[PDB]
Structure 1
Amino acid sequence: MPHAFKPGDLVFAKMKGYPHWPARIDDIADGAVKPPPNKYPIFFFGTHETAFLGPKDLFPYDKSKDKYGKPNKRKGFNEGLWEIQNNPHASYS
C-alpha cells in the first residue's frame, strides 16, 4: 500500500506551464527553510532546481512513467529523464 511521501521517493511533479517533470522528494537540511503545511521539497532532475509542492501535484514514478516519461524539447527535461532512470539518488548539487 502507498504511504505518505518520504525522502527518496521518485515522482513526476507538475508545475503550471511545464510538463510533468521527473523529480524526487528531498530531505530538509538543518536550519534550512521548511515547506508550508502539507508541502514537500521537490528536487527536479535535469534542471536541478528545488520547489515546495503539495501531494496533488506529485505522481509516483512507476505508475506514471508510461504517460509522462517521453522525451521533449524543454531545457533539462531529457537529462532529467536520464537521471531519474539511471541514478535517481545521487548528489547533483
Structure 2
Amino acid sequence: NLYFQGMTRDFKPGDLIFAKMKGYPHWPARVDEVPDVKPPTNKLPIFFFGTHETAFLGPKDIFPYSENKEKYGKPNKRKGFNEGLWEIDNNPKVK
C-alpha cells in the first residue's frame, strides 16, 4: 500500500496479502511468480484465494496479510470470499 509498502520489491512470491479492487472488499490473496509476455513493469502477479482468479496489481492495492488480518479478514457475502479466508490460513499454496 501507499508509502508503507509502496514498491513492488516490498513483496516477494509467496507473500500473503489482501488485494483491493474497485467495487470489492479487500480480498485474501498471494503474490505469485512472474509467468514467462511483457508483464506490466510496476505491478505484481496476484492470485486471489477462494475464486482462484488472477490479476496484475500495483503496490497501492496490496496490503500485508498478518498486520491486517483483524481489520480485513472478516467473513463477507461475496462469492468465494469465505473459502478464501480458509485458504489463506490453511492452504496458502493451493494452485
TM range (shorter): 0.7 to 0.9
Could you tell me the TM-score, scaled by structure 1's length? 0.88
Q: Tell me the percent identity.
A: 78
Query: Does 2:12 match 1:6?
Result: yes
SS at match of 1:81: helix
Determine which of 63, 68, 92 is the counterpart of 1:59.
Answer: 63
**Structure 1, unaligned runs of 5 or more:** none
Determine which of 42, 45, 51 is the counterpart of 1:41.
Answer: 45
Provide the residue aligned with 1:50 in structure 2: 54
Shift of 1:36: 1.3
Q: C-alpha root-mean-square deviation of aligned residues, in Å?
A: 1.4
Give the AA of the match of 1:35: P
SS at match of 2:10: coil
**2:73 & 2:38 partners in 1: Cα distance?**
29
Could you tell me the TM-score, scaled by structure 2's length? 0.86
Matched residue count:
88
Give the AA of the match of 2:34: I
User: What's the CA shift string for 1:22-55, capped at 9, x where partnerless?
Assistant: 000001222xx34312100110000000000000
**Structure 2, unaligned runs of 5 or more:** none
Which portions of structure 1, spanning 4 or more consecutive aligned residues, are displaced by more than 3 angstroms?
none
Name which of structure 1's ranges 33-42 and 14-23 shifts more when overlaid on structure 2.
33-42
Provide the residue aligned with 2:22 in structure 1: 16
